[PDB]
């Protein structure tokens, strides 16, 4: 109930997801994914995850820049489609919006199990921590533990990245 | 699953230490040097019992020790302590490094008087 | 492709599978799957042509969707129980999603459509790898989480896989698609017995892998990808066609050949529980795979098809590259039934 | 000039002086004149909340000294 | 299927991150450290089949700590009854609840 | 579960449905894959922050890494497809049948 | 709260500037005035036609190298651990891996633009 | 050529030495501040325990007043089988208070910039 | 009281941008043996006001082929982001105090490129498209190296908080410790702001007006203001990062004067560089960033991880 | 030993940037294993008291544990002040 900020941000997250999942044109799909990344960063920030939200926003900004370049190169047409320029795209968009609104009404006015379990609402503030200690950020400590506890993870991740470079070069070699 | 036992409100009353964070920080080192025994007893109770309801008397003793410490500080070095904690309080991060003269005066007073 | 790069990619595929097999953490299992897929994509595209590119694209789309569902199931399981260890899978919705993702990775029906297409679009070596090594990781995970499986869903998918493999294989003249449909049916057999005994799953997997390796190696030795090109092999090397005929008979499950051993064992295991109708249906359905194996044997070994004049020139030259493991693979594919009790060593 | 470029530079300098000075003065005006408290960690936030609770007027910057302990 | 290479060699490749009750940096505890510790100690060595029955109480407490379903149900019941009482006008709510409380440090 | 958890799960389901229902462009489906990865990142981060699982805080970053790999892989394939046909339509990937 | 207010203020100021720009002056729009600009001559094709990217491989490599930034950002906090030898070994391992990937792409003509 | 490289290297070395001295001093200052926090911690813990217990007791009395109308409600009944102390969920401490206090208790630290 | 702070931040920044236009024109003139604006207003002091009044009383154009929504959205995004990038700067106190201010600047800077991208695409003209693709190439050129340089420099700060940089450089400027990183960072900020010799998105000689060729009047003025605000902001970030002014807690005005003077010096250096050099080819910028800056930056990142551990000089605030 | 000298000269004459990068990277790799102050950094990291030191219960058989913070027993930071 308290300012509904998390609920509003998650609803905008779902709206951006519906925006790019109706697939109007990769330009507008990239715009919707950027909007979703921003609101997801906000959602994670509201839970105390500053570093993770900022990181995911930066990564998806770079990814969508590359996707924009590739859309200009290889995924264009004479008339790019928007959400109101085509009946299939508009129908999918409106169906997604109505599905989100119906699910919200179902879970808010009632307390029923959609798929997994039930939910009454009350705002996400209830399940917080009231933990009072620390001269450090716990998320920062957990993420920094990658270089002392996660040696195996670092090894596999670095090997995967090097292999990915080799792999993309092999795939695009052609001939 | 059974009911939860809670202390009465009257059991939770104790004389309060009502000095701000700058005042507490300005006297933190001497406070930890003087009131060490009750504080350590309370912390051992807290970490062994794992229940705040079983270490109330130790908390009251900690408050009493802090009150006695601050009463002595008021009795002997009111003014140097006031200057030192005002200096500490002006800072936005409440830094020790920016006020060493006032700390030196307060240290000299407490060393000579007590 | 550079031989060094090819060796590195093959080693990365195997390392991803091994990471899946040795991990205790769900994140490390997912990472093993990701690494395996990343290294596997270029191996499918080694001989570059539009068909190979199409096969690689279809394979990537299928496996990426499967991995997304896998990660979502893991995260749901973590939400309902803060556990990362691969165990009895405390949530049923997560378990359903996990089962569907693993079935999509394996190519079980009804997520079976990509297997014939990818197999037909790639070379015979890539097909050998795809149909032998790529089954190990999902089957290992399924064996580890078998106690929490829902038998209805897995048995439905296994029966569908057997039926669809037989029916689809009945219609093929291309050898790679025949092998793919055979693989679908054998995966159905492997997953039918998984909720009851994982040792039987391992035994069926080993025998199937041996027979498939012998089949693919014989097909590489005689450069045939169609029925009509395989019908020429008798006029160049009859020994290869005779060994192929015996191997096909073994893959058909006829006693006293080795391919009879898994089905037999599986049937027995299913009758140790109640489970009477399903094994009968499975055997009667495997008769279809036997039928199209027999048709291949008719085309290649039991009758002689007309040949061409230029074949005379091929008589003057010998096979340069030799497969060192082909004879042992053929022997293990055919004459292994009398050593059946050694399956005790699998558990 | 070359010294006739200076007036525009002075105007830019005067414009750029405003943000920092305004922020400092506004911080001092709304925090008792003593350099608004910084809370990068939950411990400092707890300190501020305790100060606000014991201030008696719901303002953390109102500091209670030794005169508040009888 | 599972080749326990870590157990055979004593390597600890990934076991450090499997559970929340296992040696966090700076000794930061999980929100449900005690519940998970109790469930793990209950279920250790007896197998999954027996643990699913004989450690059901500890697991239920752990899940309640994780998701807090019953706590929200109880809070919602209390709030609903209080709202009905005030709407009827018989509630007569206290000053501390309304923000007029005498705060303590 | 709170409403936010249901919203994130719904976002994942929407992205999965968008991926499973192709229109014409392969790029749009790749975008749906990236959206699924983002939803998984958000959901895992929220769970890990809520339960104060300190060592699990590095897990979402790892996810992102492989997401990038998967994103790169897809793009590479798209390039080849375009070079074959002058377009990225999934209709052209029909040389192989069942 | 303050950051949301700042974002709202900045966006509102920009939107008001656009509104003033579009509603204050006199508008005389006709077909020739709003036609696309191509230096006085009509364009041959459309601007929505495919535009070749000569540096696509570098773009994919940029996607891959961007995640190593996320991997290496927590290093200031990682430098505060008790076991500094393992942390330094792993950080140098990651940086050496990134340098090796750059060297591999460099030597195989991967940084050269397509012609 | 040589002179410029030498001058740059000397500048780098002088900066390195100065930064080493300053960083060691800053480490000592951080240790001193951390020790002050350690000295102050037990009193904060005692007051936090008293605050939590007082809020819980007030909630218990208010719930005992509110929920006496219903037939089958045990007042103060726990939701856990175990009888050991469980840290409050903070929806239990601030559940009957105004939304301003709820906002300050939930998002107060995160939104303070 | 906070809204007053926001206004007292954002209005003076706009005035500073307006008069930076005049200062750049006059500096270029006097380096080109001419005077520059000295007619309208004494010493051209009324020239920015006249330019703004002319631009906002001029008809704005909506191209027939353009996508109108993105066309209008792009300048709003540009100006709002440029104004927002100023809020975490400590001068010596920030408007918004963030634990990770540096990462916030990084994220908002990498978001700012979509203004150029979307304006160029939504213009639906060939020159605008070429400019937008050049922007894509420029970002791909500079982003990774910029991030690694930032991390390498901040390895001596101990955190990502911008205020700590003041205490880190209490005795010596950070440039005396990382002058190679300072040089590479300066070139990278020249590239990040689309400034000469890296002004390729506009490309006046090659692309007429490039990405903003279809924009006129107020929407064009907004892009101009965003660009110059980014200039001043990036130079202020450089001044804070590498030339740390001494802060007296009882006299912040001295720090403010010092920091503003350093920022003005760096901005004048930007104008000097524009007046001094020719323009790069946009593949040559990529080659410079990926073949010269990146290997040296990786080596220096290794060195700046190893050095504090080697010398027992690790900063505080884990 | 003679051909590599010519190789180094040619690299310095054609690609000085790569020469400097490799030299800096090699120094950064090998120097930390030869420095005596790395262990000083480890000790400084270990001497930072992030958490509260929980006291031990006296069983009467721990002469190495101080009974008070100012007692002569316990660890010393006197090495840190001279650094
Ligand atoms: C339910 C919720 C639905 C949400 C709706 C989104 C809001 C936009 C709706 C109004 C735009 C449509 C008007 C129009 O097209 O021309 C009108 C009118 C008609 O012109 P015309 O020449 O006769 O014919 C034009 C053609 O018919 C065709 O004209 P066209 O080619 O321009 O049509 C394309 C247009 C038409 O719209 C549609 O096709 C359908 C509308 C649905 C779009 C929603 C898709 C989901 C995208 C992600 C989620 C976005 C947030 C949603 C949540 C909202 C609640 C908070 O679609 C868009 O361009 C979408 C732009 C809006 C997204 C804003 C994102 C800002 C990016 C900043 C970066 C993000 C940072 C990280 C966070 O022309 C005008 O009056 C001038 C243009 C008006 C522009 C004003 C400002 C831009 C739009 C407002 C954005 C507000 C954001 C806050
Ligand atoms: C080598 O030749 C060239 C030059 O040299 C002669 C140039 O100058 C030059 C740059 C163009 C100039 C003519 C400068 C033009 C000046 C701007 C376009 C006007 C910007 C001024 C306003 C829009 C700023 C806002 C106005 C307000 C007064 C700010 C305060 C805001 C309120 C709300 C308060 C170019 C491109 C060039 O090529
Ligand atoms: C039999 C065949 C052998 C060769 C094939 C091996 C294939 C795997 C590749 C590498 C082997 C993995 C073994 C290393 C596992 C890491 C964990 C172990 O080594 O302990 C670490 C020891 O760290 C050491 O530094 C070893 C790690 C250094 C690894 C060097 C890189 C080698 C990888 C090269 C191959 C990988 C792919 C190719 C990339 C180039 C951490 O110890 P410590 O920190 O005290 O205590 C942690 C517990 N705390 C947190 C409570 C304090
Ligand atoms: C720096 C940023 C912040 C600045 C703060 C101030 C913000 C200013 C607001 C932004 C707009 C600036 C433009 C001002 C010019 C007026 C534009 C418009 O509002 O006027 C007319 C709007 O009027 C409409 O055309 C119809 C008339 C009113 C419609 C009736 C609606 C019902 C309202 C009830 C009215 C009864 C009396 C109201 C007083 C109580 C439009 O006419 P039009 O020619 O096309 O557009 C060009 C205007 N020209 C002629 C100057 C070039
Ligand atoms: C006192 C002695 C100093 C000793 C210093 C250490 C050894 C120094 C020499 C080692 C190698 C020096 C550079 C390599 C030899 C010369 C360069 C060369 O091979 O050819 C140049 C050629 C580039 O020119 P082109 O782009 O092809 O030009 C096209 C237009 N004509 O180089 C290449 O082809 C490949 C370059 C690979 C670069 C390596 C990638 C980055 C790695 C450095 C980052 C940090 C490394 C630190 C880790 C290593 C630690 C030992
Ligand atoms: C003064 C009278 C007010 C009238 C309001 C009308 C609004 C409108 O849409 O009209 C379209 C109007 C004028 O069109 P014409 O009909 O051709 O000119 C009329 C003059 N004869 O077009 C415009 O100017 C567009 C106005 C801008 C929209 C403002 C709000 C948009 C919000 C943008 C949100 C996105 C921000 C992105 C950055 C945020 C990221 C952190
Ligand atoms: C767009 C992306 C917005 C990013 C904003 C980042 C702000 C930031 O980093 O500051 C974090 C700041 C302070 O936290 P710490 O620095 O860790 O220290 C606090 C302890 N003393 O945290 C907060 O205040 C978070 C509160 C607000 C959350 C941000 C909400 C912004 C959401 C943007 C959505 C845009 C509107 C939706 C429509 C899309 C566009 C049409
Ligand atoms: C004791 C242990 C210490 C460890 C060693 C540390 C010392 C290392 C010494 C070397 C550091 C040098 C850093 C320089 C980084 C890049 C230098 C470079 O080589 O770049 C050039 C080019 O770089 C440039 O010239 C930049 C182009 C853009 C110019 C824009 C204007 C010029 C700058 C004006 C002054 C800027 C002042 C910088 C700092 C400002 C204050 C912050 C590469 O291009 P080419 O010469 O064509 O060769 C490549 C093909 N073989």
Automatic annotation (TrEMBL), chain B:
<protein>
    <recommendedName>
        <fullName>NADH dehydrogenase [ubiquinone] 1 alpha subcomplex subunit 8</fullName>
    </recommendedName>
</protein>
<feature type="disulfide bond">
    <location>
        <begin position="35"/>
        <end position="65"/>
    </location>
</feature>
<comment type="subunit">
    <text>Complex I is composed of 45 different subunits.</text>
</comment>
<feature type="domain" description="CHCH">
    <location>
        <begin position="77"/>
        <end position="110"/>
    </location>
</feature>
<comment type="similarity">
    <text>Belongs to the complex I NDUFA8 subunit family.</text>
</comment>
<feature type="disulfide bond">
    <location>
        <begin position="87"/>
        <end position="99"/>
    </location>
</feature>
<feature type="disulfide bond">
    <location>
        <begin position="77"/>
        <end position="109"/>
    </location>
</feature>
<feature type="disulfide bond">
    <location>
        <begin position="45"/>
        <end position="55"/>
    </location>
</feature>
<comment type="function">
    <text>Accessory subunit of the mitochondrial membrane respiratory chain NADH dehydrogenase (Complex I), that is believed not to be involved in catalysis. Complex I functions in the transfer of electrons from NADH to the respiratory chain. The immediate electron acceptor for the enzyme is believed to be ubiquinone.</text>
</comment>
From TrEMBL, chain D:
<keyword id="KW-0679">Respiratory chain</keyword>
<keyword id="KW-0813">Transport</keyword>
<keyword id="KW-0812">Transmembrane</keyword>
<keyword id="KW-0472">Membrane</keyword>
<dbReference type="GO" id="GO:0005743">
    <property type="term" value="C:mitochondrial inner membrane"/>
</dbReference>
<keyword id="KW-0496">Mitochondrion</keyword>
<dbReference type="InterPro" id="IPR017384">
    <property type="entry name" value="NADH_Ub_cplx-1_asu_su-1"/>
</dbReference>
<comment type="subunit">
    <text>Complex I is composed of 45 different subunits.</text>
</comment>
<protein>
    <recommendedName>
        <fullName>NADH dehydrogenase [ubiquinone] 1 alpha subcomplex subunit 1</fullName>
    </recommendedName>
</protein>
<dbReference type="GO" id="GO:0045271">
    <property type="term" value="C:respiratory chain complex I"/>
</dbReference>
<keyword id="KW-1133">Transmembrane helix</keyword>
<comment type="similarity">
    <text>Belongs to the complex I NDUFA1 subunit family.</text>
</comment>
Automatic annotation (TrEMBL), chain H:
<keyword id="KW-0472">Membrane</keyword>
<dbReference type="GO" id="GO:0045271">
    <property type="term" value="C:respiratory chain complex I"/>
</dbReference>
<comment type="subunit">
    <text>Complex I is composed of 45 different subunits. Interacts with CARD15, but not with CARD4. Interacts with STAT3, but not with STAT1, STAT2 and STAT5A. Interacts with OLFM4.</text>
</comment>
<comment type="function">
    <text>Accessory subunit of the mitochondrial membrane respiratory chain NADH dehydrogenase (Complex I), that is believed not to be involved in catalysis. Complex I functions in the transfer of electrons from NADH to the respiratory chain. The immediate electron acceptor for the enzyme is believed to be ubiquinone. Involved in the interferon/all-trans-retinoic acid (IFN/RA) induced cell death. This apoptotic activity is inhibited by interaction with viral IRF1. Prevents the transactivation of STAT3 target genes.</text>
</comment>
<keyword id="KW-0679">Respiratory chain</keyword>
<comment type="function">
    <text>Complex I functions in the transfer of electrons from NADH to the respiratory chain. Accessory subunit of the mitochondrial membrane respiratory chain NADH dehydrogenase (Complex I), that is believed not to be involved in catalysis.</text>
</comment>
<feature type="transmembrane region" description="Helical">
    <location>
        <begin position="1"/>
        <end position="19"/>
    </location>
</feature>
<keyword id="KW-0496">Mitochondrion</keyword>
<protein>
    <recommendedName>
        <fullName>NADH dehydrogenase [ubiquinone] 1 alpha subcomplex subunit 13</fullName>
    </recommendedName>
</protein>
<dbReference type="GO" id="GO:0005743">
    <property type="term" value="C:mitochondrial inner membrane"/>
</dbReference>
<keyword id="KW-0999">Mitochondrion inner membrane</keyword>
<comment type="similarity">
    <text>Belongs to the complex I NDUFA13 subunit family.</text>
</comment>
UniProtKB/TrEMBL annotation, chain J:
<comment type="subunit">
    <text>Complex I is composed of 45 different subunits.</text>
</comment>
<keyword id="KW-0999">Mitochondrion inner membrane</keyword>
<keyword id="KW-0812">Transmembrane</keyword>
<protein>
    <recommendedName>
        <fullName>NADH dehydrogenase [ubiquinone] 1 alpha subcomplex subunit 3</fullName>
    </recommendedName>
</protein>
<keyword id="KW-0679">Respiratory chain</keyword>
<keyword id="KW-1133">Transmembrane helix</keyword>
<feature type="region of interest" description="Disordered">
    <location>
        <begin position="55"/>
        <end position="83"/>
    </location>
</feature>
<comment type="similarity">
    <text>Belongs to the complex I NDUFA3 subunit family.</text>
</comment>
<feature type="transmembrane region" description="Helical">
    <location>
        <begin position="17"/>
        <end position="37"/>
    </location>
</feature>
<dbReference type="GO" id="GO:0005743">
    <property type="term" value="C:mitochondrial inner membrane"/>
</dbReference>
<dbReference type="InterPro" id="IPR026626">
    <property type="entry name" value="NDUFA3"/>
</dbReference>
<keyword id="KW-0813">Transport</keyword>
């Amino acid at each position: 109930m308290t300012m509904y900020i998390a609920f509003i941000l998650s609803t905008i997250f779902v709206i951006g997801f519906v925006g790019f999942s109706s697939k109007p044109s990769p330009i507008y799909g990239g715009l919707g994914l950027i909007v979703s990344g921003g609101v997801g960063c906000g959602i994670v920030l509201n839970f105390g995850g500053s570093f993770l939200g900022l990181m995911v926003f930066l990564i998806y900004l770079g990814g969508m820049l590359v996707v924009f370049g590739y859309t200009t190169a290889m995924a264009t047409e004479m008339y790019p489609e928007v959400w109101v320029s085509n009946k299939t795209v508009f129908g999918a968009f409106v169906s997604g919006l109505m599905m989100e609104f119906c699910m919200v009404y179902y879970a808010l006015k009632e307390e029923e199990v959609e798929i997994i379990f039930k939910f009454n609402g009350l705002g996400d503030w209830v399940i917080y921590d009231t933990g009072d200690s620390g001269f450090f950020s716990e998320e920062a400590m957990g993420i920094a533990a990658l270089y002392s506890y996660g040696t195996w993870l670092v090894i596999v991740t670095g090997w995967s990245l090097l292999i990915g470079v080799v792999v993309i070069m092999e795939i695009t070699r052609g001939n | 699953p059974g009911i939860v036992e809670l202390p009465t409100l009257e059991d939770l009353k104790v004389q309060e230490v009502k000095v701000s964070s700058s005042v507490l920080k300005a006297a933190a080192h001497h406070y930890g040097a003087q009131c060490d025994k009750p504080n350590k007893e309370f912390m051992l109770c807290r970490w062994e019992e794992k229940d705040p309801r079983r270490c109330l008397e130790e908390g009251k003793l900690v408050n009493q020790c802090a009150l006695d410490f601050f009463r002595q500080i008021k009795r002997h070095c009111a003014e140097p302590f006031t200057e030192y904690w005002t200096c500490i309080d002006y800072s936005g991060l409440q830094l020790f490094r920016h006020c060493r003269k006032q700390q030196a005066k307060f240290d000299e007073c407490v060393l000579d008087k007590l | 492709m550079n031989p060094i790069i090819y060796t590195t990619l093959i080693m990365t595929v195997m390392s991803g599978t091994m990471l899946v097999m040795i991990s205790s953490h769900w994140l490390l299992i997912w990472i093993g799957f990701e690494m395996n897929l990343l290294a596997m994509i270029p191996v499918l595209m080694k001989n570059f042509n539009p068909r190979a590119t199409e096969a690689a694209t279809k394979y990537f789309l299928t496996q990426a969707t499967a991995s997304m569902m896998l990660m979502m199931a893991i995260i749901i399981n973590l939400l309902y129980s803060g556990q990362w260890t691969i165990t009895k899978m405390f949530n049923p919705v997560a378990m359903t999603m996990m089962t569907m993702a693993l079935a999509m990775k394996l190519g079980l029906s009804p997520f079976h459509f990509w297997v014939p297409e990818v197999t037909q679009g790639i070379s015979l070596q890539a097909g050998l790898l795809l149909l032998t090594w790529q089954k190990l990781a999902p089957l290992s995970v399924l064996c580890q989480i078998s106690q929490s499986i829902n038998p209805n869903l897995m048995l439905t998918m296994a029966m569908l896989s057997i039926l669809i493999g037989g029916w689809g294989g009945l219609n093929q003249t291309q050898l790679r698609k025949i092998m793919a449909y055979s693989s679908i049916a054998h995966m159905g057999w492997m997953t039918a017995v998984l909720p009851y005994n994982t040792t039987m799953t391992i035994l069926n997997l080993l025998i199937y892998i041996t027979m498939t390796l012998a089949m693919f190696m014989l097909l590489i030795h005689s450069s045939a990808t169609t029925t009509l090109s395989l019908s020429h092999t008798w006029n160049k090397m009859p020994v290869i066609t005779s060994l192929m005929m015996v191997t096909l008979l073994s893959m058909g499950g006829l006693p006293p050949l080795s391919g009879f051993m898994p089905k037999w064992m599986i049937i027995q295991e299913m009758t140790k529980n109640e489970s009477i109708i399903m094994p009968t249906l499975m055997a009667m359905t495997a008769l279809l795979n036997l039928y199209f194996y027999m048709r291949l044997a008719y085309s290649s070994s039991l009758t002689m098809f007309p040949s061409t004049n230029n074949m005379k020139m091929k008589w003057q030259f010998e096979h340069t590259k030799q497969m060192k493991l082909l004879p042992t693979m053929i022997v293990l594919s055919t004459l292994v039934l009398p050593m059946t009790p050694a399956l005790s060593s699998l558990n | 000039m070359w010294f006739e470029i200076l007036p525009g530079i002075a105007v830019m300098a005067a414009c750029l002086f405003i943000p920092g000075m305004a922020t400092a003065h506004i911080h001092k005006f709304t925090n008792g004149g003593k350099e608004k408290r910084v809370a990068h960690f939950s411990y400092q936030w707890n300190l501020m909340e305790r100060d606000r609770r014991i201030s008696g007027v719901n303002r953390y910057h109102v500091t209670k000294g030794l005169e508040n302990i009888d | 299927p599972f080749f326990d290479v870590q157990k055979r060699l004593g390597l600890d490749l990934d076991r450090w991150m499997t559970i929340q009750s296992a040696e966090q940096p700076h000794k930061i505890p999980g929100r449900c450290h005690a519940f998970e510790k109790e469930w793990i100690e209950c279920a250790h060595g007896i197998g999954g089949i027996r643990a699913e029955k004989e450690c059901k109480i500890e697991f239920d407490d752990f899940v309640e700590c994780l998701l807090r379903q019953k706590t929200m149900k109880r809070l919602s019941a209390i709030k609903r009854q209080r709202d009905k009482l005030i709407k009827e006008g018989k509630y007569t709510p206290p000053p501390h609840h309304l923000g007029k409380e005498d705060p303590r440090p | 579960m709170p409403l936010v958890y249901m919203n994130i799960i719904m976002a994942f389901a929407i992205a999965l449905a968008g991926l499973l229902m192709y229109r014409s462009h392969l790029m749009s489906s790749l975008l749906c894959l990236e959206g699924m990865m983002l939803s998984l990142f958000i959901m895992s981060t929220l769970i890990i922050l809520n339960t104060h699982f300190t060592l699990a805080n590095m897990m979402p970053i790892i996810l992102l890494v492989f997401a990038a790999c998967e994103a790169a892989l897809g793009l590479s394939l798209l390039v080849m497809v375009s070079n074959t046909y002058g377009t990225d339509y999934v209709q052209n990937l029909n040389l192989l049948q069942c | 709260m303050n950051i949301m207010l700042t974002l709202l203020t900045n966006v509102t100021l920009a939107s008001l500037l656009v509104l003033i720009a579009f509603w204050l002056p006199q508008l005389n729009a006709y077909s020739e005035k709003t036609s696309p600009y191509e230096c006085g001559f009509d364009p041959m094709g459309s601007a929505r036609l495919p535009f070749s990217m000569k540096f696509f491989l570098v773009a994919i490599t940029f996607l891959l190298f961007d995640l190593e930034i996320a991997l290496l950002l927590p290093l200031p906090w990682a430098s505060q651990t008790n076991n500094l030898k393992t942390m330094l070994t792993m950080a140098l391992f990651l940086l050496i891996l990134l340098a090796a990937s750059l060297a591999y792409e460099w030597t195989q003509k991967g940084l050269e633009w397509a012609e | 050529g040589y002179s410029m490289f030498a001058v740059g290297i000397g500048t780098l070395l002088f900066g390195y030495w100065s930064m080493m001295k300053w960083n060691r001093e800053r480490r000592r200052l951080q240790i001193e501040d951390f020790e002050a926090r350690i000295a102050l911690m037990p009193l904060f813990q005692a007051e936090k325990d008293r605050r939590v217990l007082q809020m819980l007791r007030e909630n218990l009395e208010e719930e005992a007043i509110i929920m006496k109308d219903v037939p089958d409600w045990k007042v103060g009944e726990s939701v856990f089988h175990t009888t050991r102390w469980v840290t409050p969920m903070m929806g239990e401490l601030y559940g009957l208070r105004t939304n301003e206090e709820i906002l300050s208790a939930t998002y107060g630290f995160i939104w303070y910039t | 009281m906070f809204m007053i702070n926001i206004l007292s931040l954002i209005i003076p920044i706009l005035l500073a941008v307006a008069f930076l236009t005049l200062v750049e024109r006059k500096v270029l003139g006097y380096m080109q043996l001419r005077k520059g604006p000295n007619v309208v207003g004494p010493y051209g002091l009324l020239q920015p006001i006249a330019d703004a009044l002319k631009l906002f009383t001029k008809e704005p154009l909506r191209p027939a082929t353009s996508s109108i929504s993105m066309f209008i959205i792009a300048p709003i995004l540009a100006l709002s982001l440029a104004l927002t990038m100023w809020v975490p700067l400590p001068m010596p106190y920030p408007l918004i105090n963030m634990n990770l201010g540096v990462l916030f600047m990084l994220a908002m800077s990498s978001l700012a490129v979509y203004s150029i991208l979307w304006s160029g695409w939504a213009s639906n003209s060939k020159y605008a498209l070429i400019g937008a693709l050049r922007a894509v190439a420029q970002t791909i050129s500079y982003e990774v190296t910029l991030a690694i340089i930032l991390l390498s420099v901040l390895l001596m700060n101990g955190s990502y908080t911008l205020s700590t940089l003041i205490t880190t450089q209490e005795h010596i400027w950070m440039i005396f410790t990382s002058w190679p990183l300072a040089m590479m960072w300066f070139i990278s900020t020249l590239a990040e702001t689309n400034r000469a010799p890296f002004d390729l998105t506009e490309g006046e000689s090659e692309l007429v007006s490039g990405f903003n060729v279809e924009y006129a009047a107020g929407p064009f003025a907004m892009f101009f203001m965003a660009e110059y605000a980014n200039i001043i902001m990036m130079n202020a970030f450089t001044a804070i990062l590498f030339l740390g002014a001494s802060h007296d807690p009882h006299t912040p005005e001295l720090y403010t004067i010092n920091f503003v003077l350093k920022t003005l010096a760096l901005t004048i250096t930007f104008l000097w560089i524009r007046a001094s050099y020719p323009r790069f080819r946009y593949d040559q910028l990529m080659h410079l960033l990926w073949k010269s800056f990146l290997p040296l930056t990786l080596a220096l990142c290794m060195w700046h991880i190893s050095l504090p551990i080697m010398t027992a000089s690790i900063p505080p605030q884990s | 030993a003679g051909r590599i000298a010519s190789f180094l000269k040619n690299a310095w004459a054609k690609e000085p940037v790569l020469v400097a990068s490799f030299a800096i990277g090699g120094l950064a790799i090998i120097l930390p294993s030869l420095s005596p102050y790395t262990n000083y950094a480890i000790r400084i990291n270990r001497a930072t008291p992030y958490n509260y030191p929980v006291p031990l219960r006296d069983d009467g058989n721990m002469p190495d544990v101080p009974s008070h913070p100012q007692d002569p027993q316990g660890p010393s930071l006197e090495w840190l002040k001279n650094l």
